[PDB]
Design a protein around this ligand. Structure first.
Ligand code: CLA
Ligand code: CLA
Ligand code: CLA
Ligand code: CLA
Ligand SMILES: C=Cc1c(C)c2cc3nc(c4c5[nH]c(cc6nc(cc1[nH]2)C(C)=C6CC)c(C)c5C(=O)[C@@H]4C(=O)OC)[C@@H](CCC(=O)OC/C=C(\C)CCC[C@H](C)CCC[C@H](C)CCCC(C)C)[C@@H]3C
Ligand SMILES: CC(C)=CCC/C(C)=C/CC/C(C)=C/CC/C(C)=C/CC/C(C)=C/CC/C(C)=C\CC/C(C)=C/CC/C(C)=C/CC/C(C)=C/CC1=CC(=O)C(C)=C(C)C1=O
Ligand SMILES: CCCCCCCCCCCCCCCCCC(=O)OC[C@H](CO[C@@H]1O[C@H](CO)[C@H](O)[C@H](O)[C@H]1O)OC(=O)CCCCCCCCCCCCCCCCC
Ligand SMILES: CCCCCCCCCCCCCCCCCC(=O)OC[C@H](CO[C@@H]1O[C@H](CO)[C@H](O)[C@H](O)[C@H]1O)OC(=O)CCCCCCCCCCCCCCCCC
Ligand SMILES: CCCCCCCCCCCCCCCC(=O)OC[C@H](CO[C@@H]1O[C@H](CS(=O)(=O)O)[C@@H](O)[C@H](O)[C@H]1O)OC(=O)CCCCCCCCCCCCCCC
Ligand code: HEC
Ligand SMILES: CC1=C(/C=C/C(C)=C/C=C/C(C)=C/C=C/C=C(C)/C=C/C=C(C)/C=C/C2=C(C)CCCC2(C)C)C(C)(C)CCC1
Ligand code: OEX
Ligand SMILES: [Cl-]
Ligand SMILES: [Cl-]
Ligand SMILES: [Fe+2]
Lengths: 33, 137, 36, 51, 97, 334, 244, 30, 32
């Protein structure tokens, strides 16, 4: 299908940036206790 | 292969008369061509006018003809344009112009013939390389 | 352009004089051991 | 009629004809305008002007 | 519609003979007696309608007309091609050895 | 004290995070101007007529390049060695066309890097150090002077300086090989021994010291933590590294004196790169690599090719294609 | 005065045509039995104007000013030819030789570079009829040839050319050659230009004249790869007349 | 898009330089 | 320029993924 090329990069980043943020904060939480 | 009398046999004149050179004269002719000529004619071309080379086929079609020792010696005495209509000693080294082309001052007539034989022998050894230019290096 | 040329000449000149005068200001004494 | 005036009188420049996920410039949709074609006058077989 | 005019000329007589209207002056070295004196005259007077018009060049000597007559078989004329004669290319076409 | 002495004391302060110094007073503005101009031209400069034949080469990202193909393009052959500041152009548009940024960058850069060398001496003095780090740096500095300044001098044009770009650099090397047979030049052969040998000796010394680290750690921690910064003692057994290396070859091909070992590490690459910088700097004056073209002939006198003749066939391909529109006469004499 | 090369070198004056005193408003008598020549014709452009592309809706293109980027390399000089006297009394100048072309690159707003072969090659310029003297109202109008900006040996960046070069896009071995034809096939153009030369200053004694010129010609088409622009060049000229 | 990308990466490196110098782990004498 | 439009996403993930990996390890280090 003739689909917006940037949709892919947009989706990947939309997923990746907020997810990595959350993981960073979780892992350094476990390294405390 | 070797340097043999049959290689070292070139036209003396245009009559068909030929002459046979020794190893020593051909080498003398090479040394002397290097001394007095090669600055412009290395490998049989002409740096200051590439349209004219020293291939025997070129020399043969000059006026007068120069695919022979006598006409080459004469050319070193009194050079002319390819068609023979103009003398060019003023800008081409010659015995006629030994004053302004100092390297010719001390050339003996036997030296000139050595230079001629070299020129006439060398394409028989190198073929297309002589007068060919950088294509054939 | 004329204006740019002058501005660069002055700037260059200023920095060059800092360099000369700085090294003229007793640079040999400026080391951690002997003050000659 | 100057082309500039006639181009305002065209709904493709109405800002209320777009969509949320139709991205980019207006030229990406209807294209890059080149010329006014002319003002169109319709007539029926009886020569009445129709609008 | 689009052709390389020099390649097209190689399929004419320019491709086989010396073209008095078009060829570079170094080609006249190919035959005895033409170079440089007559080659220059041919080129200076160069737009000819027929190869034999070259015998009417003002000033030839009787020996020159003879040399020319001996080499008419080696000459041709085709229409002047702008890309071959502009830039002084008839005197120096960028080719040496 | 007074104002000028405060300034002087700040300039030469050993308490500044980055040392300034008197050499730094020139180095900082010249390096900033070079860097800023270079970054802007690499991204946005329009095409430059490098060879002076009204045939502009595009070097910037925005005009169709990538990181590998882009460059700041040397200034026009039409300019030669003439000085072409911005104020000598009728307009910035003219300056960009003729390659003015190149001149601005290289001149500010050669000056800044020279003062970078002097700044290394200067701080070593203020710290109580021996002074010859800056000598080592002179090998790369001289290399830079050669490709950006000396070689243009000898050849008569900054159009033949090295371009500021990845592919531009390759262009420069290929043309150099055809015009000077640098591969057959002993000084560049010295330079290759310099850098190969630098790499080899670099790996050797790293591997030998690393091999004799004193057990100061467990297997779950980086060995690197067995060393503490400023610690009195050495963290490797140099006797053991000699014992290993002396047997690998023989006892006296090996260094047991640390000072002599490290002086060798300094001198090998520095000397070699001095020689290759001198090699560019003298091929700048057309004293070229050895020429063995048709050097072997048989009893008759046929040419018997060697590998030097095969190199020459390559050189000839480079020669006759480079700057394909730039030569009208048959010898390429500069 | 009598300057020397060493007075002029590097100043930009070598690109300037000579000039005549503001008081040289005389007349050069033309003797019909006589034969004349231009011994030196000098043309110094001062402005380059390029016709803008009026978009499809168009209305009318203008000639827009441009910026010269190729420096003081633009003038035509040492041009010579015979000044004939026609039977109707006009004068006709027929260029024989001279430095009669300069490549010029000017730049338009937005950044487009426009090269052109500023030239009067094969100029033929004639006066109005029955000219018994050259005066400060004498005009010549003429036409000249504009050959291709690049000549036949010129190789494009992928090695393609007319008289030399690759004849295809060799980096795209199995591309369809059809949409690449206009770039693969180099063409050599020859077009005409028109020039007016308006005599405004005459030294009837020395036969020097000077004035302004305007010419119109096409720019470079890159051996057929793109369409040329119309260019209007304006400037000044100087000529000296000598009996032949 | 390709120009933006090259410039972005170059810009990140320059920012890395700043932190690696001014916000380094300070060396101390243990 | 007719570039590969999968190049943008390859370049972006090439940077992001390993860099995130490093950042995660470094931060959890600074907090223990
Ligand atoms: C006030 C902000 C603003 C506005 C009005 C514009 C306006 C415009 N921009 Mg610009 N832009 C902006 C900010 C803005 N920009 C910023 C911050 C950037 C940097 C990223 C850019 C970078 C940029 C580029 C690179 C381009 C534009 C372009 C354009 C044009 C087309 C826009 C389009 O298609 O949108 C599309 C809009 C959407 C698809 C809506 C997106 C919002 C989503 C749907 C909401 C997300 C929902 C959220 C996840 C919900 C969860 C919440 C809940 C969990 C609590 C338009 C004139 C384009 C153009 O034509 O320029 C020539 C173009 O190429 N802009
Ligand atoms: C350490 C500071 C420094 C240094 C050494 C340089 C050095 C240079 N710059 Mg750079 N420059 C600098 C800072 C510096 N720059 C800064 C900070 C900027 C931003 C404003 C620039 C912007 C700049 C531009 C835009 C250009 C240069 C250029 C140059 C070159 C020649 C400059 C020239 O002709 O001066 C000549 C030097 C002197 C006259 C100084 C002599 C010192 C004596 C003692 C004083 C003489 C009195 C003097 C004439 C009085 C001035 C006024 C008078 C004319 C009325 C040279 C490589 C040009 C270039 O690279 O062209 C290729 C150029 O185009 N520079
Ligand atoms: C197959 C292995 C091999 C070997 C042995 C060599 C050897 C050499 N190369 Mg070559 N080279 C190779 C592969 C090789 N090369 C490859 C694959 C490439 C890339 C295609 C190159 C590209 C290359 C270039 C471009 C150049 C060389 C050069 C050299 C010389 C200096 C190298 C140097 O200092 O190295 C660094 C090593 C050291 C400093 C350590 C010492 C090494 C020496 C040679 C050994 C000592 C032998 C000893 C005296 C005898 C035994 C002693 C015993 C009695 C106790 C040397 C002849 C240069 C040259 O031609 O000089 C003439 C040069 O310009 N090399
Ligand atoms: C395996 C094959 C091989 C090898 C090993 C070499 C090895 C070498 N070649 Mg040879 N070369 C080869 C094949 C080879 N070449 C071939 C095939 C050709 C012909 C096509 C050439 C043609 C050739 C030429 C024409 C040149 C070389 C040069 C060199 C040297 C390059 C390194 C150098 O100059 O460092 C020296 C150091 C520098 C150049 C760096 C200067 C650094 C400045 C001062 C600082 C820069 C700072 C920077 C901008 C900012 C950093 C900031 C950052 C921290 C943020 C080295 C000896 C060059 C040479 O001798 O140069 C003098 C040279 O110009 N080669
Ligand atoms: C090509 C190889 C090469 C490069 C790139 C290089 C680079 C460097 N070596 C340095 C040092 C050294 N290198 C040394 C030996 C060697 N260096 C070698 C080879 C190199 N060395 C070799 C082979 C040796 C063995 C002899 C020593 C002994 C030293 C040092 O002491 C010195 C150092 O301090 O080490 C850490 C640094 C100089 C810092 C400086 O001047 O900042 C000043 C300039 C700055 C900060 C920015 C300039 C930016 C300019 C204006 C950019 C535009 C202009 C450029 C010229 C663009 C070029 C574009 C390219 C694509 C070609 C720098 C990281
Ligand atoms: C069929 C049969 C015969 C089988 C039986 C086999 C057998 C038993 C045979 C009999 C024995 C026998 C030898 C037979 C004859 C064969 C024979 C002699 C073969 C020889 C082969 C040969 C010539 C090899 C070449 C030799 C060789 C590899 C090179 C020597 C040159 C040389 C000295 C090289 C290195 C140069 C150098 C000085 C190195 C320093 C580098 C450097 C400073 C590194 C950094 C560093 C160094 C340190 O030093 C320490 C300390 C530390 C810290 C450190 O950083
Ligand atoms: C940190 C960055 C990492 C996060 C990024 C994650 C990606 C998020 C992407 C969200 C945007 C979706 C992009 C899809 C569009 C796209 O693919 O085309 C890409 C489009 C641009 O459009 C492109 O333009 C081109 C010519 O320039 C051509 O027309 C292309 O065809 C067209 O795709 O992107 C945008 O225009 C970006 C700017 C949008 C900003 C305006 C938003 C204003 C509305 C306010 C909304 C607030 C709502 C908040 C609610 C709570
Ligand atoms: C995990 C997260 C992602 C990690 C980073 C991802 C980027 C990694 C780099 C990916 C490769 C980049 C290729 C450019 C992108 C692209 O265009 O590819 C796109 C190409 C596919 O090609 C696409 O194909 C399409 C038809 O389906 C069309 O042809 C498109 O035009 C074309 O782009 O991707 C690949 O082909 C997949 C890669 C598989 C390669 C395996 C062979 C290599 C094995 C050698 C590995 C040795 C490595 C040694 C290192 C030490
Ligand atoms: C027939 C021709 C006519 C003859 C011509 C002769 C010309 C030859 C010139 C000889 C020059 C003298 C030798 C060099 C100076 C010196 O000895 O250094 C002094 C030191 C002191 O040595 C150290 O000596 C110490 C004792 S002391 O310092 O000497 O007192 C000792 O502590 C330590 O163990 C020991 O290593 O030497 C060393 O540290 C050992 C390494 C020696 C390395 C040689 C110099 C650098 C090599 C450059 C090679 C460039 C490679 C380029 C690659 C492309
Ligand atoms: C440059 C300074 C030259 C030197 C040294 C020598 N020659 Fe030359 N040669 C040169 C030119 C420019 C020309 C052409 C002149 C012309 O317009 O005709 C020549 C020509 C010859 C020829 C004729 C070749 C032909 O095909 O007809 C010969 C035989 C010749 N030159 C020989 C020659 C010798 C033996 C030299 C050493 C003593 C020598 N030349 C030096 C340029 C130069
Ligand atoms: C004071 C002082 C100091 C400091 C200093 C400084 C900090 C300086 C700065 C300086 C700088 C900071 C400089 C700058 C420079 C820059 C430049 C000079 C630039 C240029 C550029 C250009 C010219 C560009 C152009 C272009 C291009 C290239 C492309 C596109 C377009 C354009 C046009 C834009 C110190 C500490 C030492 C101490 C002493 C005192
Ligand atoms: O520019 Mn750069 O390169 Ca040294 O040679 Mn001549 O010039 Mn060009 O040719 Mn080959
Ligand atoms: Cl090139
Ligand atoms: Cl040339
Ligand atoms: Fe060490």
């Amino acid at each position: 299908m003739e689909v917006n090329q940037l949709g892919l990069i947009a989706t990947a980043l939309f997923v990746l940036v907020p997810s990595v943020f959350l993981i960073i904060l979780y892992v350094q939480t476990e390294s405390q206790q | 292969a070797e340097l043999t009398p049959e290689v070292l046999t070139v036209p003396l004149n245009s009559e068909g008369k030929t002459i046979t050179l020794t190893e020593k004269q051909y080498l003398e002719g090479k040394r002397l061509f290097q001394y007095a000529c090669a600055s412009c004619h290395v490998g049989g071309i002409t740096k200051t006018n590439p349209s004219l080379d020293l291939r025997t086929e070129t020399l043969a079609l000059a006026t007068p003809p120069r695919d022979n020792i006598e006409g080459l010696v004469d050319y070193m005495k009194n050079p002319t344009t390819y068609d023979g209509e103009q003398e060019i000693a003023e800008v081409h080294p010659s015995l006629r112009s030994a004053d302004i082309f100092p390297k010719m001052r001390n050339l003996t007539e036997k030296d000139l013939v050595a230079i001629a034989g070299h020129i006439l022998v060398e394409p028989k050894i190198l073929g297309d390389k002589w007068g060919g230019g950088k294509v054939y290096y | 352009m004329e204006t740019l040329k002058i501005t660069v000449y002055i700037v260059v000149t200023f920095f060059v004089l800092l360099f000369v005068f700085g090294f003229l200001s007793g640079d040999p004494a400026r080391n951690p051991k002997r003050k000659d | 009629i100057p082309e500039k005036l006639a181009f305002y009188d065209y709904i493709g420049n109405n800002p209320a004809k777009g969509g949320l996920f139709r991205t980019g410039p207006m030229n990406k949709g209807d294209g890059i305008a080149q010329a006014w074609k002319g003002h169109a006058v319709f007539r029926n077989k009886e020569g009445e002007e129709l609008f | 519609e689009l052709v390389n005019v020099v390649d097209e000329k190689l399929g004419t007589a320019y491709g086989e003979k010396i073209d008095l209207n078009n060829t570079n002056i170094a080609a006249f070295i190919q035959y005895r007696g033409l170079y440089p004196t007559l080659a220059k005259l041919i080129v200076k007077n160069a737009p000819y309608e027929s190869v034999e018009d070259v015998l009417n060049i003002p000033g030839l000597t009787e020996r020159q007309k003879q040399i020319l007559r001996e080499n008419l078989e080696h000459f041709t004329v085709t229409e002047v091609e702008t890309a071959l004669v502009e830039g002084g290319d008839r005197y120096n076409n960028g080719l040496y050895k | 004290a007074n104002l000028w002495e405060r300034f002087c004391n700040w300039v030469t302060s050993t308490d500044n995070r980055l040392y300034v110094g008197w050499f730094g007073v020139i180095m900082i503005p010249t390096l900033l101007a070079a860097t800023i101009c270079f970054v802007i031209a690499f991204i946005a400069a329009p095409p430059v007529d490098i060879d002076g034949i009204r045939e502009p080469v595009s070097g910037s990202l925005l005009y169709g390049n990538n990181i590998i193909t882009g460059a700041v393009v040397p200034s026009s052959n039409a300019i030669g060695l003439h000085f072409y500041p911005i104020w000598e152009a009728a307009s910035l548009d003219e300056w960009l066309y003729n390659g003015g940024p190149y001149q601005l960058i290289i001149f500010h850069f050669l000056l800044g890097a020279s003062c970078y060398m002097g700044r290394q001496w200067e701080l070593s003095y203020r710290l109580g150090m021996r002074p010859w780090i800056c000598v080592a740096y002179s090998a790369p500095l001289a290399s830079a002077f050669a490709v950006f300044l000396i070689y243009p001098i000898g050849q008569g044009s900054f159009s033949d300086g090295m371009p500021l770009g990845i592919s531009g650099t390759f262009n420069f090397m290929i043309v150099f090989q055809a015009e000077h047979n640098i591969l057959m030049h002993p000084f560049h052969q010295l330079g290759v021994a310099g850098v190969f040998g630098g790499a080899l000796f670099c790996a050797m010394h790293g591997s030998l010291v690393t091999s004799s680290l004193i057990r100061e750690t467990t297997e779950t921690e980086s060995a690197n933590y067995g060393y503490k910064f400023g610690q009195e003692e050495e963290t490797y057994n140099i006797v053991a590294a000699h014992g290993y290396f002396g047997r690998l070859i023989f006892q006296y091909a090996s260094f047991n004196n640390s000072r002599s070992l490290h002086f060798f590490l300094a001198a090998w690459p520095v000397v070699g790169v001095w020689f290759t910088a001198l090699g560019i700097s003298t091929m700048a004056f057309n004293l070229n690599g050895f020429n063995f073209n048709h050097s072997v002939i048989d009893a008759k006198g046929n040419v018997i090719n060697t590998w030097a003749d095969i190199i020459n066939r390559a050189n000839l391909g480079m020669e006759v294609m480079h700057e394909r529109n730039a030569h009208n006469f048959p010898l390429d004499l500069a | 005065q009598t300057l020397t090369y060493d007075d002029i070198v590097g100043t930009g004056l070598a690109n300037k045509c000579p000039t005549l005193d503001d008081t040289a408003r005389g007349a050069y008598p033309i003797d019909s039995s006589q034969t004349y020549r231009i011994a030196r014709l000098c043309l110094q452009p001062t402005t380059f104007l390029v016709k803008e592309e009026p978009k499809n809706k168009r209305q009318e293109a203008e000639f827009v000013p441009t910026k010269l980027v190729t420096r003081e390399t633009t003038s035509l000089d040492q041009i010579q030819g015979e000044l004939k006297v026609n039977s109707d009394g006009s004068l006709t100048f027929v260029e024989e030789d001279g430095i009669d072309f300069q490549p010029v690159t000017v730049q338009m707003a937005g950044g487009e570079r426009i090269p052109l072969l500023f030239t009067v090659k094969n100029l033929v310029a004639s006066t109005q009829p029955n000219v018994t003297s050259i005066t400060t109202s004498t005009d010549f109008k003429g036409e000249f040839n504009v050959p291709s900006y690049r000549t036949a040996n010129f190789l494009d960046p992928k090695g393609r050319g007319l008289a030399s070069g690759y004849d295809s896009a060799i980096a795209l071995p199995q591309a369809k050659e059809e949409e690449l034809a206009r770039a693969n096939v180099k063409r050599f153009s020859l077009t005409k230009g028109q020039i007016s030369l308006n005599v405004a200053k005459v030294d009837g004694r020395t036969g020097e004249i000077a004035g302004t010129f305007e010419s119109e010609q096409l720019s470079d088409d890159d051996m057929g790869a793109h369409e040329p622009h119309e260019v209007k060049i304006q400037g000044v000229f100087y000529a000296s007349i000598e009996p032949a | 898009m390709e120009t933006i990308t090259y410039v972005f990466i170059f810009a990140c490196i320059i920012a890395l330089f700043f932190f690696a110098i001014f916000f380094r782990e300070p060396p101390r004498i243990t």
